[PDB]
Amino acid sequence: TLQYTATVAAPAPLVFDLVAGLENWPQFHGPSVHAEPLGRRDGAEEFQHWWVIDDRTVRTWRARWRFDSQALRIGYTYDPAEPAAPAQHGEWTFRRLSDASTEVRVEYELLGDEGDAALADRELRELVDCVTDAAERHEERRDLVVDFEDPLFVAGAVDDAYTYLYEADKWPERIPHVARLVMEERVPNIQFFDMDTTTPDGSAHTTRSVRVCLPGDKIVYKQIQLPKLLTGHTGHWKFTPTREGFVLGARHTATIKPSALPILGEGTTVLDARKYLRRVLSANSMGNLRLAKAFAEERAGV
């Protein structure tokens, strides 16, 4: 049995919550793109995981988790991943050292012979490092992290709006200011693209996104090449049926980089950056939502 232990300057329940909240790892852990709950399996919670492991490759695998918020323990088993990574079995424990200090310990084993133990060790340490940072900077992140979702009712079929937001390779001809989009989808329903967006002031900004596409449900994405103002940006396009149509949701979770605040002008505060992002990101997304809505409603005979 292998082991890694670290000290986190935050309360144990907060650290436990960060690790247990699998769907939110993408908010503070670089490689994490999504985690999708798949139901129970005799008391365990089954999940599918997606990590971006280089700028054109995603690793996905199935896992089963056991969360104990009373004992502050988390058990997990990973099936073998694609591309190959070994099966793994482990346990997290979170131990009080003081009111605001915690000892995190992970004990685990790789199953089988074919793994890269060095790689697995480094990946665990980076995850624990990210947990540590998110926990220790919890109060600061309440100001740096801009998290919101804007909905729009659509009187039509989910599949039509889903197709519209899924076929991003067509956006340059459909969505204003989308000047270029270079799509890669070698693995079905896992997309990478570079995108150039123009703005009224001349300049054009390139970003790169990775998306996990869940047909009929949602598209979850993460920007892996970011604007200078951000250290993180995740979001989705979500489709929620109602009795009279469905409600398309555009979420953004964007993390401000304090050192880049001056990019918005002399005197820019964190709140100024939050206001900028909330307005600019929602305006861009609402443009997409209204286009997807029109597309779906047209196909529904209005």
- The residue whose two tokens read 């989705």 is 236
Token reading at 68: 């104990």
Q: What is the resolution of this structure in A?
A: 2.0
Token reading at 283: 């305006």
Q: What is the CA radius of gyration of the chain?
A: 21
Cα gap 272→214, rounded to integer Å = 35
Report how far apart, in Å, the C-alpha atoms of 229 and of each of 31, 189, 258, 282 are. Answer: 19, 29, 8, 16
Q: Which residues does 165 contact at the CB level (< 8 Å), separation at least 6? A: 219, 237, 288, 292
Cα gap 204→281, rounded to integer Å = 16
The answer to whether the CB of 179 falls within 8 A of the CB of 196 is: yes
Backbone angles phi, psi at 21, to 5 degrees: -80, 70
Nearest to 281 by CA among 250, 237, 247, 248: 250
Nearest to 106 by CA among 82, 81, 119, 125: 125
The answer to whether the CB of 113 falls within 8 A of the CB of 94 is: no
- Torsion over CA: 190, 195, 199, 205 (sign): positive
Token reading at 245: 């149509």
Cα gap 280→251, rounded to integer Å = 13
Backbone angles phi, psi at 162, to 5 degrees: -60, -50
Q: Which amino acid is at 75?
A: G
Cα gap 248→289, rounded to integer Å = 7
Cα gap 284→231, rounded to integer Å = 19
Exposure of 8 in the CB half-sphere (CA atoms within 13 A): 31
Token reading at 225: 């090449």
The answer to whether the CB of 95 falls within 8 A of the CB of 102 is: yes
Nearest to 33 by CA among 248, 244, 184, 253: 253
Nearest to 35 by CA among 73, 3, 69, 67: 67
Nearest to 49 by CA among 4, 95, 87: 87
Q: Which residues does 261 contact at the CB level (< 8 Å), separation at least 6? A: 229, 268, 269, 270, 272, 273
The answer to whether the CB of 213 falls within 8 A of the CB of 221 is: no
**DSSP for the chain?**
-EEEEEEESS-HHHHHHHHH-GGGGGGT-TTEEEEEEEEEETTEEEEEEEEEEETTEEEEEEEEEEEETTTTEEEEEEPPBBTTB-EEEEEEEEEEEETTEEEEEEEEEEESS---HHHHHHHHHHHHHHHHHHHHTHHHHHHHEEEEEEEEEESS-HHHHHHHHH-GGGHHHHSTTEEEEEEE-SSTTEEEEEEEEE-TTS-EEEEEEEEEEETTTEEEEEEEE--TTEEEEEEEEEEEEETTEEEEEEEEEEEE-GGGGGGG-TT--HHHHHHHHHHHHHHHHHHHHHHHHHHHHHHTT-
| Helix 117-136 × helix 12-20 angle, to 10° | 130
Chain centre distance of CA 93: 24
Domains, the chain, in order of start with CATH, read 1-142 (3.30.530.20), 143-302 (3.30.530.20)
- The residue whose two tokens read 């340490």 is 125
Measured between alpha carbons, how far apart are the two ends of the chain, in Å?
61
Cα gap 183→257, rounded to integer Å = 28
Backbone angles phi, psi at 254, to 5 degrees: -115, 135
Token reading at 260: 């880049």
Nearest to 102 by CA among 75, 72, 123: 72
Cα gap 93→5, rounded to integer Å = 10
